[PDB]
Paper text:
Among the sweet-tasting proteins, thaumatin is ~100,000 times sweeter than sucrose on a molar basis and about 1,600 times sweeter on a weight basis. The intensely sweet taste of thaumatin has been widely used not only as a natural sweetener, but also as a flavor enhancer and for masking unpleasant tastes in the food and pharmaceutical industries. Site-directed mutagenesis studies revealed that six lysine residues of Lys19, Lys49, Lys67, Lys106, Lys163, and Lys187, and three arginine residues of Arg76, Arg79, and Arg82 located on the cleft-containing side are responsible for sweetness, and two amino acids residues, Lys67 and Arg82, are particularly important for sweetness. In the present study, three mutant X-ray crystallographic structures of thaumatin (K78A, K106A, and K137A) were determined at resolutions of 1.07, 1.07 and 1.01 Å, respectively.
The threshold values of sweetness of K49A, K106A, and K163A were 140, 140, and 180 nM, respectively, which is about a 3.1- to 4-fold reduction of sweetness. The structure consists of 3,267 protein atoms including hydrogen atoms, 20 tartrate atoms, 18 glycerol atoms and 300 water molecules. The normalized B-factor ratio of Ala106 was 0.68 for main-chain and 0.72 for side-chain and those of Lys106 in recombinant thaumatin for main-chain and side-chain were 0.61 and 1.25, respectively. The normalized B-factor ratio decreased by 0.53 for side-chain, suggesting that the flexibility of side-chain was also reduced. Besides, the flexibility of Lys106 is substantially lower than that of Lys78 and Lys137 in wild type structure, suggesting that the lower flexibility of side-chain at interaction sites might not help support good complementarity with sweet receptor. The detailed structural assignment at an atomic level revealed no significant conformational changes in interaction sites of Ala106 as well as Arg82 were induced by mutation. With K106A thaumatin, the volume of positive charge from lysine residue was reduced but the distribution of charge was relatively small when compared to K78A and K137A. Compared to Lys78 and Lys137, Lys106 is not relatively exposed to the molecular surface. As to Lys106, it was 5.0 Å from CG of Asp173_T1R2, which also interacted with Arg82 in the length of 4.6 Å. Since the interaction to Asp173_T1R2 still is retained, substantial reduction of sweetness might not be induced by K106A.
Residue numbers in the entry: 1 to 207
The structure:
């Protein structure tokens, strides 16, 4: 499957793509404002994620740091990123269909549209100004809006027991972005797409 990753933000981002135990494609790349990077994701990828990273530095070997979304200091991510990270999430070719969502469960850093480029389903978007409106206790000094699990490490926010409800913090994310997951047990906003669809992830879609 092809994913075109487009940075419409006025700032550089470092895109990242991983399924947690491996890179997807090269796993990461710099995207200056306006740049597009097309990746190939193997059919059948389950639990893949794409995100943006901000305020990164890398040496000539591809090691460094990012202020949001840092994946073990690598340019070319093999693991998931450090919150806060707005997440484009997908599982492809799962019994004949693809499943896509946006999640704020690991916080928010950059606004996002995640849409098919092929027929048969709709996209999802989280493009509100969550960083600007972020509750004071959730603001990440390194940049972004943390989720409450990251900040407070409770069973209720992290949904550790499989039993949790919405919270004042989840409700903030949900109010700004109804179409994205706000906590683990949120009413799902997953879209079912034809199997083997192709996609576009746009950072700062309303930029």
């Amino acid at each position: 499957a092809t994913f075109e990753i487009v940075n419409r933000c006025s700032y550089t981002v470092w895109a990242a793509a991983s399924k947690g135990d491996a890179a997807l494609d090269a796993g990461g790349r710099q995207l200056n404002s306006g740049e597009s990077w097309t990746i190939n994701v193997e059919p059948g990828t389950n639990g893949g994620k794409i995100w943006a990273r901000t305020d990164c530095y890398f040496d000539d070997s591809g090691s460094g740091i990012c202020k949001t979304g840092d994946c073990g200091g690598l340019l070319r991510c093999k693991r998931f990123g450090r919150p806060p990270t707005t997440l484009a999430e997908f599982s492809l070719n799962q019994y004949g269909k693809d499943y896509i969502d946006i999640s704020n469960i690991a916080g928010f850093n950059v606004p996002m549209d995640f849409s098919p480029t092929t027929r048969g389903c709709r996209g999802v978007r989280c493009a509100a100004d969550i960083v600007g409106q972020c509750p004071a206790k959730l603001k990440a000094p390194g940049g972004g809006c943390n989720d409450a699990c990251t900040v407070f490490q409770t069973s209720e926010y992290c949904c550790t027991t499989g039993k949790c409800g919405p919270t004042e913090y989840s409700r903030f994310f949900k109010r700004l972005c109804p179409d994205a997951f706000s906590y683990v047990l949120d009413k799902p906003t997953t879209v079912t797409c034809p199997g083997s669809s192709n996609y576009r992830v746009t950072f700062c879609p309303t930029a």
